Assembly symmetry: C4
Homo-oligomer: 364 residues x 4
């Protein structure tokens, strides 16, 4: 029945109107500067990059989504075998469901069976930390899929509107996370869930030892909208209130700038609303080390293995086109390519004290 | 006559299209920065605050609306008994009608019968001060409902277009107000009525001893529109002129910044177009001490006691959501939470010499 | 057959869609700040002002329009007797047509018969000066209506697209104008015709002794559009080209700022798209000494004497409402009232080197 | 078969919806300051200018388009004879086709037969330079039409999406172009193809001896869109990806600023979306020495000789109207006329470090 929520999440995300609903990534305010003399050939473009101790083929990851029941495992299986084929990292959805129910384990474990080489990323929610999870649950989440890192998700906006939500984010949870990180043999990434990471949140996590961030900004999947729908469906009055919050959060573009600026040495996944290899290029150019995606991967996976393979060819082709067209022979060159920032993202950055000169230098 | 106007005001406000008609609060240029790690739990959020010598449950008030006839008292009764239940302050509509006609008194006094503990705020119009009111009329408006404060309304835009309006705002009125304040045993609040308080107006009032303000800016009920409609109804030619003034006034968000900036120690109600607990949180984060609402409370009261209780539950939920999602454990924390100011509001503040650095410290 | 042009002009302005066509005044970027405590009563508002050696009742003028044939005279007669009634100045249309044909004289002279006391303003085009008019033609235009001033119009944009247009603006004409002005017993005003006066044009005229300006900016009557329509009517190919120029010119608001900034001691009519007393109040607040109107006066005059009387009552009411609601007891106070400049107008002024600080000192 | 591409190119450009598709020149952010007193007569405006060693009648050129087959030749013939009649320069389409196929030569050579006096500009693609072209190919393209210059085109965006495209832009090609330019008896112009020249690209080319640039920015013919359409037609999957890149590139107005700013002594053609003589005036005012056009000349030429003659009368009329209305007696005066830059173009220039003060001095 946490199982039911897992199913409902997929169903609404895949089939209802929640992608970018009343929200915006601010990526339209980011322009990559065209170079009519690139100085390179398309074929020499190198998209290889580091993901902790592994090498990955493309600076893109699939971020965590699902697991909990056997038809969710079959979706995981499809994503995983394509991810493995393409050499891209994959996170799984929250594994709480499997900690609570042993029959749910196999829908996660299937990932590692079919993708023995790529980084795989475990997932647990911050609220479970204030509610009694500790080391053991972490190591269990990790060994279940022989994970290379574990993501801990921030979802307070979701929890607030979720019919059976748990909005508990007491400071003690970070004391615990920091102790646990002592004992883990893989790194921790803190990721959001559609509402983005701000400078204050980034600096607070950093002060507890967190070095790896996944922006999951607003503009992509709208998790407040998903829970709103689940509220309409139950006739739960929170639904009209969630409607007033549909545009709540830090936009992806702004969150990439905020995290890069306030924690210049972070390893940074720029995600929330990444829908094309152009978006992924902008995310990286702006300051991310890698671009994350979830929803469009889900929708293709549902359509099948070949649809998902095609989706990835397309993303990769687009990313490379953007590198071609900015004269960027590799990922490091894209991270320093010339951009223009306009409109509302410019005004956000200015109001937040983001000095563009030092910004430019920090993103590189 | 005056009673007919009182009923027509309610009916037009309640049932015609005047809410935000060709006007704007500028609150869409205000963004509360999401914090994916709040550092608190939902259940620990504290919404209590000061309202002069009383404590109120939530930093929200219902501002003055009606009174004058028995069906208007029945609306006052509904508002008052729900306000009392939720522990929130309530102002009554202009009591001039009851000063002029003893049969109108009971439609005010009913408020205190059903709401013995909450702050109750009296109401008189500034024009009546240039036209012969003084101490006695103030003390009467007060004792009629054993008020904890009295509001004096500014409504020159309304009076200019009102068919039987009285646009008299001689400086002598403030000389009188200040002398009256000497002798009153409750504080005075000066409030506008849909057209907002500017820095020059705030400073001028302050120079006469007024320390309590209620912005009532444009963007919510449009009182120029209400009178325009009364003019169309009478075939009074002022109607076409009112139409040219529909967007006249200081937008609520700009008025909050102006007052807090030019009178930093003010006690400040941010109102005019507050329609959700998100709007209330914005008003407060921007500089108000409390958020005020009138029209949506009127529309729900008309639907009934249960509709209005539901309305309040919703507003409070929303407010707390916004506190949750900004890491604000209490109202003082919300007053200092991180914001972003964009677009037209930003341009307003810059043109008006509102130095943002100093704005920040003053709102805190 | 210039007389045909004269009638076509009135016909197209009055009945085709040329008012504000693809053009803008920039007055929506100017806000007058609302003062909830005006410090005055409506009844004490004084709209009187100076118009050269006369006193006028309201800071508004009717700018020049027509004359040429007897039905045009009957329009002039209607405008003139209402203008006299209200104590406002009136300019006539270009009198070239009456210099060229004696039968046209009476359609101008009729103005002075029916309006013995108000300022009356003669009119001649600049191109006639380059092409041979001199002193005598000026004095004849003047005596024909016992004018208190003569306007010389700048219409190169019009002349460029006008089928029989004369786009001759050789610098010599200004030498002549200056010599003429030596010998005239009444002042010269230089006015545009829908395309506005720039700082360069204003400083150039000033260097030749011109101190009185009428901005006639874009946003109101679009004379390029009028000529485009006359071009379509003749199947003259200039019509398509005129279409590309529909938004050509300095917007009225930007023209007011430019002229007041570059010639601080000018006597300044702000006109072009003034359609309401609020527009007239903005124009003055921004820097003009008086607001001018032509098209809407033309349209009401056609409908008749009483419709035009009503038109003026409305304008005057509107102007005074703006004064009331900014706390401006008189015209000099309105010239110093608080404003906000936003958006495109702001970006215009910044780009053109209009230092806002010095701007505010200079308009007062 | 390259010949098929040549035909399809013309056919899609002339008859599909690709002019300004999802793209923008930014020319609407550029305003020419109207001068109500021009100081000149229309008839004295002088549009003569230099094009390398020749004089041309008007500061406009037709940029290269087509050639390859005899119906393409007949379009080249029409353009050429009108170009000759009006005294304007004409570039031809990429002559690769005629290097590869002797039967395609005559469709280029026809240009010189019918236009013995005007400047004629040859055309080759940068990618053919990385892939083996050298001096001889350059000299053949030149002698084939007795060219006065040869344009080399930058089209990586196009090549990336083109079904049979060749996205090779290795730095070596510039070493070769530099050596070739040693040996050529005519100058080289480097032009883009709808995606614009940036300051990095311009400075790089300059460092290799290139002093003549043709911006061909975004906002006019969208070459990504043309290839996208060829991809739809073949069912090539690159189509959906092209669609994500529709708004890729430097807008014409920004490109002109960037090239003029970064290479102040460049000879500069401003092109890409020039559709009227007002556009042409803006491009020159902003920094270009000449305005270039392709697509609308193609569409008129297809309709016939008289339609193209009319097209040019109209452009020239428009150009001269903009000169008249800015008080510009000649091209040098238009280069230094007063402008206003707003909106996104302003923000582009600011973000890219284009100091407007120095920009003004350099543009003049
Ligand atoms: C079906 C579904 C289910 C979930 C997710 C998403 C989707 C679409 N996401 C959030 C996801 O990882 C990502 O942060 C956001 O969806 C933003 O990225 P997109 O806009 O979806 O590309 C998510 N996040 C996480 O940390 N734990 C989880 O269990 C889930 N569950
Ligand atoms: C039916 C009605 C009647 C009145 C009002 C409003 C309404 C809706 N308001 C103005 C009100 O207190 C408030 O300042 C504005 O209406 C702006 O807030 P809202 O946008 O309505 O929340 C009001 N204010 C006041 O000072 N004296 C009055 O008697 C009235 N009367
Ligand atoms: C019918 C008609 C005819 C004329 C005009 C206008 C109208 C509508 N205008 C221009 C007018 O005085 C004014 O400068 C512009 O029309 C801008 O003001 P409005 O937008 O019309 O208020 C005018 N101006 C002028 O100086 N001499 C003229 O003869 C004319 N003719
Ligand atoms: C049908 C057709 C075909 C070509 C072109 C254009 C058109 C419409 N253009 C690009 C052209 O010269 C110009 O740079 C762009 O089209 C932008 O100008 P417009 O927006 O078309 O005015 C072009 N450029 C070039 O250098 N070599 C070429 O062979 C072609 N071919
Ligand atoms: C987008 C995400 C973070 C969805 C998971 O939310 P849940 O709140 O349903 O996750 P668990 O409680 O099962 O950890
Ligand atoms: C919005 C407001 C302030 C309504 C009161 O206006 P009135 O002008 O009808 O109030 P009184 O004259 O009865 O004081
Ligand atoms: C807006 C104006 C100036 C209308 C008069 O234009 P014309 O060019 O027809 O006037 P004259 O030649 O008769 O002076
Ligand atoms: C806008 C341009 C550059 C059209 C010609 O491109 P092509 O790519 O077809 O030209 P070639 O390969 O024939 O040189
Ligand atoms: Mg949860
Ligand atoms: Mg009143
Ligand atoms: Mg004329
Ligand atoms: Mg090619």
């Amino acid at each position: 029945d946490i199982v039911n929520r897992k199913v409902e999440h997929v169903e609404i995300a895949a089939f209802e109107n929640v992608d970018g609903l009343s929200s915006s990534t601010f990526l339209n305010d980011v322009i990559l500067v065209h170079q009519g003399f690139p100085g390179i050939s398309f074929s020499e473009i190198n998209t290889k990059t580091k993901f902790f101790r592994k090498e990955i083929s493309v600076p893109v990851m699939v971020t965590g989504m699902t697991g909990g029941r056997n038809e969710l495992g079959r979706i995981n299986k499809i994503i995983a075998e394509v991810a493995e084929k393409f050499g891209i990292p994959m996170g799984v959805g929250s594994q709480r469901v499997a900690i609570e129910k042993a029959e749910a384990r196999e829908s996660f474990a299937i990932v590692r069976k079919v993708a023995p080489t790529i980084p795989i990323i475990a997932n647990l929610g911050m609220p479970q930390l204030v509610k009694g999870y500790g080391l053991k649950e972490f190591q269990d989440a990790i060994q279940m899929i022989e994970a290379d890192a574990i993501a801990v998700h921030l979802n307070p906006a979701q929890e607030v509107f979720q019919p059976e939500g748990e909005p508990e984010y007491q400071i003690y949870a970070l004391e615990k996370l920091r102790d646990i990180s002592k004992e883990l043999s893989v790194p921790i990434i803190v990721k959001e869930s559609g509402n983005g990471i701000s400078m204050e949140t980034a600096k607070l996590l950093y002060s507890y030892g967190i070095k790896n961030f996944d922006t999951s900004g607003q503009g992509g999947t709208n998790w407040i909208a998903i829970e709103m729908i689940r509220d309409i469906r139950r006739g739960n009055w929170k639904a009209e209130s969630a409607k007033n919050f549909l545009d709540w959060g830090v936009p992806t573009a702004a969150s990439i700038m905020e995290v890069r600026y306030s924690v210049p040495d972070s390893f940074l996944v720029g995600s929330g609303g990444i829908r094309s290899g152009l978006d992924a290029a902008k995310a990286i150019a702006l300051g991310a080390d890698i671009a994350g995606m979830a929803l469009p991967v889900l929708k293709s996976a549902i359509e099948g293995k070949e649809s998902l393979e095609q989706f990835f060819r397309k993303i990769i082709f687009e990313l490379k086109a953007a590198m071609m067209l900015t004269g960027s022979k590799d990922v490091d060159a894209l991270k320093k390519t010339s951009i223009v920032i306009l409109g509302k993202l410019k005004e956000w950055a200015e109001y937040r004290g983001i000095n563009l000169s030092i910004y430019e230098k920090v993103r590189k």
